[PDB]
Amino acid sequence: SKTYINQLSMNSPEMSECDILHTLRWSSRLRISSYVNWIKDHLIKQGMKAEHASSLLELASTSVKYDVEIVEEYFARQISSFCSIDCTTILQLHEIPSLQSIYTLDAAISKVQVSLDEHFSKMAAETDPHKSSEITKNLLPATLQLIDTYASFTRAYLLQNFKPSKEKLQGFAAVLAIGSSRCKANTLGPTLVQNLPSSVQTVCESWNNINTNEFPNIGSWRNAFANDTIPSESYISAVQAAHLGTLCSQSLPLAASLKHTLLSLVRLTGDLIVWSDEMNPPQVIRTLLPLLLESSTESVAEISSNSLERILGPAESDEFLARVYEKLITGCYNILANHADPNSGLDESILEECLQYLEKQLESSQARKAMEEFFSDSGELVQIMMATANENLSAKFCNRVLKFFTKLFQLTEKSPNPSLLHLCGSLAQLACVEPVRLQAWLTRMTTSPPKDSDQLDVIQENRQLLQLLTTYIVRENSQVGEGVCAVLLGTLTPMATEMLANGDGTGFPELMVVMATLAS
């Protein structure tokens, strides 16, 4: 109708999802396929003579700029709508967008990909390809933030479908954030995912079995769809049919739509990063790194790796491997320190495995580098040993972490490097520890276990290696300093006097080996 012509001719304000869907097809229609004559002929009817009709038709479409403008405005609207939710919190199902918005966004990105690809393919010829970088000066940040939002959305969709409480839900989120197996760089991921008993294997496998082959292929719009007049319209129709087909499912309907939209978004990001003259590393690297390492994104991580390898490193020797290792250490510290409680859905084996892995990488020099940089920037070796004070956990975890200290100091002594010296100086912050937690922690080992317990041997070896690590600290070459020793003596004397007084002196005969060496 003429009202549509005037509503979108000189401007396109107050549009909606249905308006966007109709407008994309209409605008693509009146370009090359000779519907323009049909439109003006019908405009002759209903009372518009040809002079107005031709002028409005000419000034309604002028081409790529129109597409990027409208889709940028749609992206801005979607980002503004989703910006009301931020930080890192688990989102409910009800705040996930409805199917209409999802396939509207999918159609928008598909049209943008097709138009940009044809524009750059025709720009492959000629001698002036630089006149196309200024139109994508704003697409990239919006695309990255939208990708981050949708990754959060699919992560929340997987999480909330696992009545489990919120605390172990956050624990499961921490476990799965460093999961995934499609990347060969990490090793813990599959093991930590698989050792959980029943919840995150059947559900995770059922959700990972949602294949998206019913959708059109990567470049199917170039070969199987270029025969017709407007290949973009056929591609949009196929995508819409694929999205509509998912409604019949009863187990996990939105999974296929979310997977496909994330895949298309990351592919468009890669194509844009190829075509964009302006390229700014840190945002794209931090918004693409979690994709490879996320268990909730495994059907997409390969494209992310492909796009990141060509720009940030050959994936074996460059700094990308060190960045991946740094992400692994960050995740390991997070899970070890924050969710040590046994009610966070955590089995002791998960902490055991991650501790073993991070020792194994601590042995290697190249990983030990990033190890020390991360514990110097934001990490803290002391949190791991504070985690032992939790009375809700067995003594095997304490044994493993204490053996961890034994081995890092052994590697410090045998093969001294500046990273090991710096981490030796790192534990000097034991003075900053408030007295109550350190008193409780010392009470954890210093208390004699019941003689009917199976951990008597474990605690005996713990006492032995505690004396050994004490000798390690009190060494002159050690960088911890005498203040830590003085405060340790001050907070070891009183309850020593106490359990000599009220108690029978159990566990006393091997105490002197500790604070006597402290005095040394």
Swiss-Prot record:
Belongs to the UBR4 family. Component of the SIFI complex, composed of KCMF1, UBR4 and calmodulin (CALM1, CALM2 or CALM3). Interacts with E2 conjugating enzymes UBE2A and UBE2B. Interacts with RB1. (Microbial infection) Interacts with protein E7 from papilloma virus HPV-16, HPV-6B and HPV-11. This is E3 ubiquitin-protein ligase UBR4. E3 ubiquitin-protein ligase involved in different protein quality control pathways in the cytoplasm. Component of the N-end rule pathway: ubiquitinates proteins bearing specific N-terminal residues that are destabilizing according to the N-end rule, leading to their degradation. Recognizes both type-1 and type-2 N-degrons, containing positively charged amino acids (Arg, Lys and His) and bulky and hydrophobic amino acids, respectively. Does not ubiquitinate proteins that are acetylated at the N-terminus. It is linked to Episodic ataxia 8: A form of episodic ataxia, a neurologic disorder characterized by episodes of poor coordination and balance. EA8 affected individuals have attacks of unsteadiness, general weakness, and slurred speech. Additional variable features include twitching around the eyes, nystagmus, myokymia, and persistent intention tremor. Inheritance is autosomal dominant. The chain holds residues 1016 to 1546 of 5183 of the full protein. The modification Phosphoserine is found at residue 376. The UBR-type zinc finger forms a pocket that mediates recognition of type 1 N-degrons. In addition to substrate-binding, the UBR-type zinc finger probably positions substrate proteins in the proximity of the bound and activated E2-ubiquitin conjugate to enable their ubiquitination. Constitutes an atypical E3 ubiquitin-protein ligase composed of a hemiRING-type zinc finger, a UBR-type zinc-finger interacting subdomain (UZI) and an N-terminal region that can serve as an affinity factor for the E2 conjugating enzymes UBE2A and UBE2B. Compared to classical RING-type, the hemiRING-type only binds a single zinc ion: a hydrogen bonding network is present instead of a second zinc ion. It is found in: Cytoplasm; Cytoplasm, Cytoskeleton; Nucleus. The modification N6-acetyllysine is found at residue 65. The gene is UBR4.
